[PDB]
Amino acid sequence: FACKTANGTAIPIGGGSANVYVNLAPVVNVGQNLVVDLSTQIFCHNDYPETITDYVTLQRGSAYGGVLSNFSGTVKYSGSSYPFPTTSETPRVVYNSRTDKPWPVALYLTPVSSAGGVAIKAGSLIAVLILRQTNNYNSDDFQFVWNIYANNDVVVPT
Amino acid sequence: FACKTANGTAIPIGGGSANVYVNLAPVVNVGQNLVVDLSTQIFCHNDYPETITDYVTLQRGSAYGGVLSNFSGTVKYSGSSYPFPTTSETPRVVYNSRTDKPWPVALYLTPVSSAGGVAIKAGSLIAVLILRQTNNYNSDDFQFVWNIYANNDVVVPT
Numbered sequence A, B: 001f002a003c004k005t006a007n008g009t010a011i012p013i014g015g016g017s018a019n020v021y022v023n024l025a026p027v028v029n030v031g032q033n034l035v036v037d038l039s040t041q042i043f044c045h046n047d048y049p050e051t052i053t054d055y056v057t058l059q060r061g062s063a064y065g066g067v068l069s070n071f072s073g074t075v076k077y078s079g080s081s082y083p084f085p086t087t088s089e090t091p092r093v094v095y096n097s098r099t100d101k102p103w104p105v106a107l108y109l110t111p112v113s114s115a116g117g118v119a120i121k122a123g124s125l126i127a128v129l130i131l132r133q134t135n136n137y138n139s140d141d142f143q144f145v146w147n148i149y150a151n152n153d154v155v156v157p158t
Ligand SMILES: CC(=O)N[C@@H]1[C@@H](O)[C@H](O[C@@H]2O[C@H](CO)[C@@H](O[C@@H]3O[C@H](CO[C@H]4O[C@H](CO[C@H]5O[C@H](CO)[C@@H](O)[C@H](O)[C@@H]5O)[C@@H](O)[C@H](O[C@H]5O[C@H](CO)[C@@H](O)[C@H](O)[C@@H]5O)[C@@H]4O)[C@@H](O)[C@H](O[C@H]4O[C@H](CO)[C@@H](O)[C@H](O)[C@@H]4O[C@H]4O[C@H](CO)[C@@H](O)[C@H](O)[C@@H]4O)[C@@H]3O)[C@H](O)[C@H]2NC(C)=O)[C@@H](CO)O[C@H]1O
Pocket: A001, A002, A013, A014, A045, A046, A047, A048, A049, A052, A053, A054, A134, A135, A137, A138, A140, B001, B002, B012, B013, B014, B045, B046, B047, B048, B049, B052, B053, B054, B134, B135, B140
């Protein structure tokens, strides 16, 4: 079981960490949503599906930089809404195909009342999301750590 | 990670056991050495070397039959000498190629002062060597057990 991003960055068997740079909506009004859809960037496969099924959760997530300071929001995992930052583990997603299939994570963030000007500086760390893989065969309990970086400024006009 | 012998006998992923039949000096004097070079019999590979590192040790080695009764000895593991029978686990050998590569083990056995006559009966178990595989990714601790059989009698002249 391993995970790849669109831009080529990979975390191999056994887990690890990676830096993912995501393009953001250059401007977001107070009361609009900013969406960070990792389901179109992170894809995971099962390396021996004939005997084993892999179990994937969003174990925990934290906000940093402008997302921490200037945004409230939730995370959507496989169709359900969860608090963000998430302090508790999500239900499991099954992987039993060699075919790259998405990690169904998307952040829904709204600027806060007092937000104004550059609310996310380009190149800054905006979140850390921990993917936890287990299986039905082994004692394997791996963490794939995704450090989420902003590719561009995000402006909240006032 | 799996291991094969020269005559084709194999121990699959997860570990197991095999019989290795070794040719010995038909006659060996007290103070001469009898050498069992396993590096020409046992071969192991790493089944995913690109991301993974396999670690191999001699967990224990034990003497049986005539070798126990009538021989002193040492084992040489990857350039270093250790007593045989073994009093500790050995440092690690790295396996990082899908190509079958030897297990760098050699037994040096010398008949003891009181040794005389037939010291090893052909077909008898003379040693058991436990190869322990680990890795750099999970908690896998697998045992590849090698039962060492004499292909011929050995006589210690008096
Ligand atoms: C004789 C017999 O039957 N013995 C039994 C044995 O077969 C059986 O287990 C399986 O043996 C198969 C024999 O080939 C193995 O298939 C290959 O797996 C490779 C990946 O191996 C690593 O991953 C597995 C699974 O664990 C990871 O993945 C799962 C799945 O998501 C996940 O749950 C885990 O958490 C983890 O992320 C591990 O078991 C392996 O561990 C062993 O080996 C490592 C490395 O030495 C040790 O460190 C470790 O301790 C173990 O000893 C590995 O970590 C795949 O890379 C490989 O893919 C090739 O072949 C398939 C076959 O179709 C292709 O589809 C695929 O594209 C790929 O082909 C490419 O590469 C080939 C050569 O590399 C080449 O020939 C091709 O042309 C092409 O280029 C394949 O899927 C299988 O993994 C073994 N399973 C297990 C669980 O170990 C065991 C199991 O009970 O019993 C024996 O008795």
